[PDB]
Amino acid sequence: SESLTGTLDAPFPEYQTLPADPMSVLHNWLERARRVGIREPRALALATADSQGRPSTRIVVISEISDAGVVFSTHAGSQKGRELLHNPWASGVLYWRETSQQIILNGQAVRLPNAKADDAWLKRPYATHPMSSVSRQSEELQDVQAMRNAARQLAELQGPLPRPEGYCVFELRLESLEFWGNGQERLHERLRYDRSDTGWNVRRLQP
Amino acid sequence: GTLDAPFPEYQTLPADPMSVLHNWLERARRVGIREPRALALATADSQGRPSTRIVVISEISDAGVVFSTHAGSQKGRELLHNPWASGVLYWRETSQQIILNGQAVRLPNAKADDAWLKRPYATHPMSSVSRQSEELQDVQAMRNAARQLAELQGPLPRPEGYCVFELRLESLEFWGNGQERLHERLRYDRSDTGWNVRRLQP
Ligand SMILES: Cc1cc2nc3c(=O)[nH]c(=O)nc-3n(C[C@H](O)[C@H](O)[C@H](O)COP(=O)(O)O)c2cc1C
Ligand SMILES: Cc1cc2nc3c(=O)[nH]c(=O)nc-3n(C[C@H](O)[C@H](O)[C@H](O)COP(=O)(O)O)c2cc1C
Ligand SMILES: O=C(O)[C@@H]1CC=CC2=Nc3ccccc3N[C@H]21
């Protein structure tokens, strides 16, 4: 049995019109996702790779769309952080079950300045600050209750804490994108962009 | 996170992560998670640059998980030269992730024949005419060619490039939302004799 469950109309005029500027398509799709109530449309399955080219994956949230790509925050000492600092190339996929749409985002992640990290940190609900402050993301957790107790002590403040060392913001500066829609008669609609010396090259891909 | 999401394994540390995987997937099916087997699968090219896309896990095997694709696709070409891959399952309803890391191996043609025959026959026409991920020069021509094949009573022959991969796991992580933002992370790594297990900081 085919696994697709999407039933919401998902207009894809861009597959016909081939807009020159793919970030407009990204904005169009994300705005529509917000308006129709897609659940967690910005949950990005982000892939990085280690020193030997072995991929790793996890979900991160896209916090902003920038001129050059998409932005997310994480811990520098995490697996993804360590991998990106050595090999900036990454790829992430958005998949929206309700509309049977995928967006694939490929590019190089760049760590943004601390001033930007400071701002992103302050924009998080302060209830998130204690655990993010005590946790060394992705290192082994030796004592669960100890971590719980330490966070609870910091939570007493009931206000913002200093940005932890290692809390950082990456901009994934895009070099290619794909927009995927279910299409008609299983001719899935794949619109592929690749950065060129000036602007972008645009192609349709076979499903 | 709107549905119940028990994670007793975070407390008990079961020795066999494949048991945990089977149990999580069965639970997902029972509670009615939407498309639980939609795997965001990452591969990488010869420069170490990742690429991603969704594929569906067709079966859970002794060594890992299985999916089908076209050998000439981007993921197929990448796996042919670099077998290492990683995939993530994310279930919004229970705020759970499963991360699967290992090496993908192409299975024999008899296995591919069986997988092909198990697909709904209505999928056979487009899968036969399409060279997945190659540039599409003429949309209507592809549509018309598939329409010609759709008139047949299936099944059609398996197209040469239609293949099955087994992702043989070397590590797994089970992630749950936990309490007080202490997200619960259970990480397994293959050893010479079995599996090592640990908890990770959120
Ligand atoms: C819905 C969801 C969103 C998440 N968003 C982020 C995020 O924006 N940044 C982050 O560092 N981790 C986020 N996480 C946790 C990551 O998936 C992951 O566990 C953590 O970043 C460690 O990844 P790593 O060990 O591969 O580096 C999120 C998890 C879920 C379930
Ligand atoms: C929900 C969903 C499930 C999919 N499952 C598969 C699959 O099992 N096998 C496959 O080859 N493509 C599958 N696709 C299409 C892929 O996402 C992708 O477009 C195609 O495999 C080409 O990927 P590539 O160019 O990166 O190799 C699926 C797409 C969606 C939206
Ligand atoms: O659940 C399905 O059939 C998938 C849905 C969308 C696209 C697919 N492409 C495939 C290509 C080759 C083999 C299996 C696929 N699965 C479907």
Swiss-Prot record, chain A:
The Swiss-Prot or TrEMBL record lists the needed cofactor(s) as: FMN
Q: Which residues bind FMN?
A: 58-61, 73-74, 79-80, 102, 137-138, 190
Record-listed substrate binding positions:
3, 75, 124, 132
Listed SUPFAM superfamilies: FMN-binding split barrel
GO biological process terms, semicolon-separated: phenazine biosynthetic process; pyridoxine biosynthetic process
Pathway involvement of the protein, from the record: Antibiotic biosynthesis; phenazine biosynthesis
Positions the record marks as coiled coil are none
Keywords from UniProt, A to Z, are: Antibiotic biosynthesis, Flavoprotein, FMN, Oxidoreductase, Virulence
Q: By its UniProt entry, which Pfam families does this protein fall under?
A: PNP_phzG_C, PNPOx_N
- Catalysed transformations (reactions): (1R,6R)-1,4,5,5a,6,9-hexahydrophenazine-1,6-dicarboxylate + O2 = (1R,10aS)-1,4,10,10a-tetrahydrophenazine-1,6-dicarboxylate + H2O2; (1R,10aS)-1,4,10,10a-tetrahydrophenazine-1,6-dicarboxylate + O2 = (5aS)-5,5a-dihydrophenazine-1,6-dicarboxylate + H2O2; (1R,10aS)-1,4,10,10a-tetrahydrophenazine-1-carboxylate + O2 = (10aS)-10,10a-dihydrophenazine-1-carboxylate + H2O2; (1R)-1,4,5,10-tetrahydrophenazine-1-carboxylate + O2 = (10aS)-10,10a-dihydrophenazine-1-carboxylate + H2O2
Q: Which GO MF term does the entry hold, naming one?
A: pyridoxamine phosphate oxidase activity
State the family named in the UniProt similarity comment for this chain.
Belongs to the pyridoxamine 5'-phosphate oxidase family.
What does it do?
Involved in the biosynthesis of the antibiotic phenazine, a nitrogen-containing heterocyclic molecule having important roles in virulence, competition and biological control. Catalyzes several oxidations in the terminal steps of core phenazine biosynthesis. It oxidizes both hexahydrophenazine-1,6-dicarboxylic acid (HHPDC) and tetrahydrophenazine-1-carboxylic acid (THPCA) and thereby contributes to the generation of both phenazine-1,6-dicarboxylic acid (PDC) and phenazine-1-carboxylic acid (PCA). It synthesizes phenazines in their reduced form, which are the likely end products in vivo.
Return the protein name.
Dihydrophenazinedicarboxylate synthase
State the organism named in the record. Pseudomonas fluorescens
